[PDB]
Amino acid sequence: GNKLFNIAQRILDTNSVLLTERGDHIVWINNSWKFNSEEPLITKLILSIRHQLPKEYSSELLCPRKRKTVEANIRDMLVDSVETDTYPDKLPFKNGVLDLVDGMFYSGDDAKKYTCTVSTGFKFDDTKFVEDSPEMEELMNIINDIQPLTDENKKNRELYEKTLSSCLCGATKGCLTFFFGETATGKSTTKRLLKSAIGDLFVETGQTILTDVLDKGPNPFIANMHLKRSVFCSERSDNIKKLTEPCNHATIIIDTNYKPVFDRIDNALMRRIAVVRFRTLDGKIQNNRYRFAFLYLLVKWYKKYHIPIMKLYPTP
Amino acid sequence: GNKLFNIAQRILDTNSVLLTERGDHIVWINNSWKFNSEEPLITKLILSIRHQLPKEYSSELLCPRKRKTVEANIRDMLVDSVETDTYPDKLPFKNGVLDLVDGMFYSGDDAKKYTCTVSTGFKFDDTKFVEDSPEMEELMNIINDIQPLTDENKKNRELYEKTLSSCLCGATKGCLTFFFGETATGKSTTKRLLKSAIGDLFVETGQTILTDVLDKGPNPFIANMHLKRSVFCSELPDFACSGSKKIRSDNIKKLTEPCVIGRPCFSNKINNRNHATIIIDTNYKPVFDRIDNALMRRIAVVRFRTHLDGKIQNNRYRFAFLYLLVKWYKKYHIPIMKLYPTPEEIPDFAFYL
Amino acid sequence: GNKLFNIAQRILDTNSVLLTERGDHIVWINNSWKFNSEEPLITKLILSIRHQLPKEYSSELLCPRKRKTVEANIRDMLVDSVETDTYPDKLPFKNGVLDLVDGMFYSGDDAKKYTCTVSTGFKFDDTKFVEDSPEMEELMNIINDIQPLTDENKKNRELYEKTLSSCLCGATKGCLTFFFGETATGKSTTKRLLKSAIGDLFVETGQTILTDVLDKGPNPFIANMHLKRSVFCSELPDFACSGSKKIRSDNIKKLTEPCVIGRPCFSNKINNRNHATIIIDTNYKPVFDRIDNALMRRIAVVRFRTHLDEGLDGKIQNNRYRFAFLYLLVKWYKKYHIPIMKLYPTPEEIPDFAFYL
Amino acid sequence: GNKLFNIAQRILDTNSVLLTERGDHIVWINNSWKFNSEEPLITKLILSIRHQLPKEYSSELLCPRKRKTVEANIRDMLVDSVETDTYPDKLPFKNGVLDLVDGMFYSGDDAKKYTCTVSTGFKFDDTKFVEDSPEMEELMNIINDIQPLTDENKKNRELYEKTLSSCLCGATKGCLTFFFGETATGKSTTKRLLKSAIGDLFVETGQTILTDVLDKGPNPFIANMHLKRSVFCSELPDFACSGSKKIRSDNIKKLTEPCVIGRPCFSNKINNRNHATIIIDTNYKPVFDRIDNALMRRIAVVRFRTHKVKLLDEGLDGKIQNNRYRFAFLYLLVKWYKKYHIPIMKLYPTPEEIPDFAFYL
Amino acid sequence: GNKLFNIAQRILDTNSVLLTERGDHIVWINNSWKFNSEEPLITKLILSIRHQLPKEYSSELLCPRKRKTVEANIRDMLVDSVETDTYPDKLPFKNGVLDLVDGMFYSGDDAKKYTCTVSTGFKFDDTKFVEDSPEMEELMNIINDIQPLTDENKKNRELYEKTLSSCLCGATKGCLTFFFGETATGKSTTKRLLKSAIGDLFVETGQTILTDVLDKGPNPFIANMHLKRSVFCSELPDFACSGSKKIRSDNIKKLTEPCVIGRPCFSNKINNRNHATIIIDTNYKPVFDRIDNALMRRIAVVRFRTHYDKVKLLDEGLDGKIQNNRYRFAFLYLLVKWYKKYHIPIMKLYPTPEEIPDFAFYL
């Protein structure tokens, strides 16, 4: 007849605290799948959930030790692990997610089964996520200057569109991309536009990922890629074959200034290699005014190309 | 309902205890935002806020076992984090925040809004902040001795002014300062004036910051330069000798990002904010590990030419120097705070150009 | 409201507990400010101060589980920090503090004002602290044998007196002293006399501090010289042999600064206060890394020229001339360092230094 | 009131617990000062001293949670520290101390003023500390065989006796001794006899204390020399070969000081007390890095010249590890100490035994 | 009086728990002196001894909080330390102590008095420890195939028998032995045959200790030979190719004293008791650093010639029915018989210096 055990059972029934394969407890507070290995949030979860329980049950959660007892019961009652970040066609935010093939924004319980732990780093407000704005005029004008919307540059433009749209897929990508061009030819502009568009779903690394073995010494560059949907390499064939394995949601794109050279050249790596060529403001980018419009363009391109199947073709 | 829970709710209602984005708990005692991972700061706040509660809630907070319960409740009711030190043009003091753009010194509750947790470590007195006194006479004389106001030492004088004035702004900087010159010139005098002016906001770090990788396990030499406006890495050794490490060029790009990595012992706080205008007081021109085009945009050098110490240590010259510093700030950094590199001084850099 | 709360307030009213900027809690037991980061010190003071409170308050402090509650309130009532050791002209013993300007010995509440956390380690005897004593008569003979009172050895003996007398000032010194001389020249006897005189405020460390980058990793050899008033670095080896690491020139500049850098094991404090008078006990002329004018203002040298009493060391470890040397040092101090305390270099006594000059 | 406080006061009154300068709490159980830095032994003494209090206090100390309170009170009443090991002419055993000036055994409160924190590790049975025994003659036969009592080997014999007997005085010695000789000469026999005689006050440590620096990082090989009365540094290599580190002169110089610098692992204690007589069980001529008078004023040499050749005894080592000649050698050492180091304990160097020193002379 | 104190006194009077010099707390559960520095086993012993005490105390030792109190009482009565492993002629198994001078097998209290801490690892079966068995004949045949009993192999066989039999005595040995022979001769077969007989009292230490200074830094490969009856060294490379280090003369001198110097990683214990029976397995003739008379007193060689002098056929089941301890007790009986034949009065191993060409040259 333990009332605290019934409290623990009722809280566990709501599917709020989950055990992941990595040995951690993920909790659901304030419309976000938080997790902290250092300090557990189970007590905070109980204190926040206190409101949705009957009056006799909700009146004991104020003591700082009954909550510890309930935490012990809950962490003793979690036996099996769960699989998270299984849906690739959803884009996270700090107050919901975005479904792309149909293209609407979910919040609260309506987006809780979508167990995704990583986020983008900025909230979502849909009143400015519509085409009717001057800002989109400026943005696609900048896009057309950096990449002309013409016939002589049709294939390059479409490959650019597909490559930048592929960064929203929450799954493994099996094709390397290079941005090859000259100095001040939009590479910095493109990387900044991307990192303003998606945000925390983006990590920028260096040359080291393409010169050293990925399993020697303490190397976070393999660990900082964990559940990131975009990796931009600025500044080895085995590395090339390594980055295209499921274990990894990163679209691998390296910006280059000169013609590349590989350790070996064969047909094995030529089926995973694509390239584009560049042959052609900043103040309001850290301000991030060009954030939702570029996301809308990327969503439109994803709807244009990657609804039925997501797959990148090499361009030898 | 409860007696030990309404007290925690009331204490949280005063907006006195906040959670930082780094997991720290900042508290507001005696008109100062203080944070410490060792002291029971929340428990001290609970006892010090005892006078703002009704008479029935005041007789409970004397027993330590009740204050531990109150602190446990408060630690569990702080779920959403906050941003710290958002304003880059405010200077903190033990008893209030001084506005740099205007000049008025806000005290008490008016300084609560500016969430500046680091401080100078001493109270600020407006009486000594006057423009005219024998003290500032000694100062102007001394600095004109150290850096003459002559014509050739005019371009170097104004960039020296820029470097010393940038020591107040709480934003991420993007340059390297090198105090190049011969000995017995005034570099140590300038460093101690700056120390006496800015108090806690001044640290002196070792040379492992420059010539070693700052990512191996614990490193309190990085965790100390957290939000610090200026640090010193003086006494740079020679490099054209039989056995000597180099500046390790790749390490200086780590010093321009606002995300310097490094954790202290017995803790998990690994990332620290970089507000520092780090100054390298050297005697010889440095030699980096490798030289490239991305290095000439983040390096500035002051040349010391002109070839008392006891009263400086007595915080005597403090307020007049701070006043000179704020006047110098309100001439060069009012619209935008920015530092420009001086690459032409390095012989290698001039050769490349 | 609470009897223990009032008991804790009473202890704080006497201003016996203090909190320093370092994060430590210094206490006041037996006329001496004592601190320790491991031993229980606040509870010891709470038990000792029991014969100050009224009778109804003195009976609860006999319960050990009640002395951890009053101490818990005391730890919560200390909000701000205070400054310690700001008087450079006072020498503390285990039962008082001697004022060096005049020589009167304070003890009790009058000794509370000078917050000196370090202690010499023994009690000061007023009866032995007199000029006329047989021990003083023998000590004068021994010292005059170590350093003769002749004409050609006057400046050397005056600077020797200055260096020895500088060991009582609690302020940063801007010079390093080299004790150069051959074997059996009294440097060991002088060191042992100094150790018996100033006691705890005298530490000996290895040459690692002189030539090693004194920042990386724990270095308790520097964390030991926190607030110490004398540091003796003996056993400097020969440098003419191929394989001897030369003396690091930049470390000397670091050892003459008002705050040295370095951290002990299992701690997070890296800044230490430098009150020491660095004395290097060498046997040969030293060899440096690189010579410049940045160093000839920071080095002084004294030579020893007299080349035996077998029972001398017997009555040295027995602290026989403990107070006569103290009197001599005090008399020398109030002969050169009364207006201002500061040291001067002697670059002419070093061969390469003279060459550069 | 608070009988658990009156009990603590009574225990403190008898002066059984003390605080040392290093921070340890030495207790007094079974006529021996014991201490353990890892876990305190205050509760052990609290339980042991139960038979020296009235009956109403005797039944309270049977509850461990009632002994922790008394231990806390005792810990909170000790404020001042005391000095230890200030008597150099006493030799402590497990069950008392032996006074060497006249050689008398004190036990109980008769031996408590001499705060000796070290012990030999075994008991001293008076019945075998005499001359009338068969083992006594065997010991004399062994000793007179290792070092013959001739006239050509009298100075060597006297210096050998002085060096061996100096291992009982707990003061600082300022000379180093080299046990020079050929192999299978009896140096090992002398070492095991000394180990069986002085017990735990005998440590053998590797060569790192003469070739390397003792300041870089930890060095427990020197942290174990704290308050040991004799040390052996056997197995000296060939310096005439290629790639042999010489004995550093500074290392020799620092080892003859009242305080040595060196720290253990995971500790902050830097200074150790040096009471040890240093013996270098070598086989070849030592070679130093540099020669100067401060080095020839700290070297003593004794020679071993008996492989005259005697017959090997196979059962000799068997009845040595069995501590058979334990009290006989102790009696011999006491007799020699009563003859050589009564007024002042001092060691002297002999420079006319090493070729470089002889050339320097 | 205190019922939780008479129980502690009763448990102490049986001398079931002792205090060793190294600070550990050896207990006695299921006929074995177990010890654990990390966590204490006194609470296991307290519940195990529940039956010996009368029924009035039996119902009290079930609550863990009372067993904690009894453990706290017990830990405050162990004032004086005792000595362990002082009996050389005893072999400890997991269920008793085999007396080795006359070949009995004690158990329980009879095995308690011989305070032995290290154990063989497995159990002892008196039913299989017999001379009349087909496995005995099989093993007897294997030994004769590896080492024939021909008169040309008289000294080389009894020396081999003595060397193998010395691997049971728990006393310091003052000589070294060299298993020298060509590849595929029986050295590697002897090693697995021996390691299957004694068990834990056998470690295959690396080559390192013979060509390295075992003083500086940590040497866990030195701290491993704490009270191990036999240690085996293999992989002796050629002394002519690149990397030809020399067998240091002083190094073998240190592995003969009753106490060896060395500390493990992150520890301060520098003294280790030496019960080893160092055997160096070599294929080529070793070259030493320098040859002096003090070395030849601690050298022995056992030549192996059978594949040569004999061309016996290579068996395949040999390595199969060895690693699954078939000839475990059968080899034990042979070793005990040889020990009975060779060392009753005193254990001692003698050198054979007139067998290495360098020593023969020196002699």
TrEMBL record, chain A:
Query: What part of the entire protein does this chain span?
Result: 323 to 690 of 785
Tell me, how does this one assemble? Homomultimer; hexamer. Interacts with OPG148.
The record describes the protein's role as: Multifunctional protein required for genome uncoating and replication. Major viral uncoating protein that is required for the release of the viral genome from incoming viral cores containing the viral DNA genome. Possesses an ATPase activity that is required for hexamerization and uncoating.
Q: What is this protein called?
A: Uncoating factor OPG117
- Organism per entry: Monkeypox virus
Family stated for the protein in its record:
Belongs to the orthopoxvirus OPG117 family.
Q: Where is the SF3 helicase domain?
A: 155-280
Automatic annotation (TrEMBL), chain B:
User: What are the residue boundaries of the SF3 helicase domain, all occurrences included?
Assistant: 155-307
Q: Please describe the quaternary structure of this protein.
A: Homomultimer; hexamer. Interacts with OPG148.
The family note in this entry says: Belongs to the orthopoxvirus OPG117 family.
Its function? Multifunctional protein required for genome uncoating and replication. Major viral uncoating protein that is required for the release of the viral genome from incoming viral cores containing the viral DNA genome. Possesses an ATPase activity that is required for hexamerization and uncoating.
Q: What is this protein called?
A: Uncoating factor OPG117
Natural source organism? Monkeypox virus
Summarize which stretch of the complete protein this chain spans: 323 to 700 of 785
